[PDB]
């Protein structure tokens, strides 16, 4: 259930617009499951609204918070499902660098993936 297919581009834009208008300080994020994934538990929430002072490291933890896992096993958070980015980078950097056409930033969580 990928978001880019669920919602048409114009709709996604409308959403991004209304919400960036609603919260002009926060980045809009779409975290999805790696479709090749079967091991990890699904993520109940799909859309995240994050501050700019937030780091990837913190966001990953927040995403982890929504899932019940053995306190040890980590997973990878791919931006655009193709970019392994700096753990230290802020949401703002990731936003400016990897902004999708519709204004969202798209992420994908995977326990393992091969390219």
């Amino acid at each position: 259930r990928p978001f880019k297919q669920r919602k048409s581009l114009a709709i996604r834009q409308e959403e991004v617009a209304g919400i960036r208008a609603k919260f002009p300080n926060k980045i809009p994020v779409v975290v999805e499951r790696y479709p090749r994934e079967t091991f990890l538990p699904p993520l109940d929430k799909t859309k995240f609204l994050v501050p700019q002072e937030l780091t990837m490291t913190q966001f990953l933890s927040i995403i982890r918070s929504r899932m019940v896992l053995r306190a040890t096993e980590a997973f990878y958070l791919l931006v655009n499902n193709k970019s392994l980015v700096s753990m230290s980078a802020t949401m703002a950097e990731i936003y400016r660098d990897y902004k999708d056409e519709d204004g969202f930033v798209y992420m994908t969580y995977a326990s393992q993936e091969t390219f």
Binding site: R6, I19, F23, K26, K45, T46, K47, F48, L49, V50, P51, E53, L54, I62, R66
Partner: peptide, 9 residues
């Protein structure tokens, strides 16, 4: 359910 998770600070 297609709705936002609002995080802050």
């Amino acid at each position: 359910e297609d709705e936002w998770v609002n995080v802050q600070y």
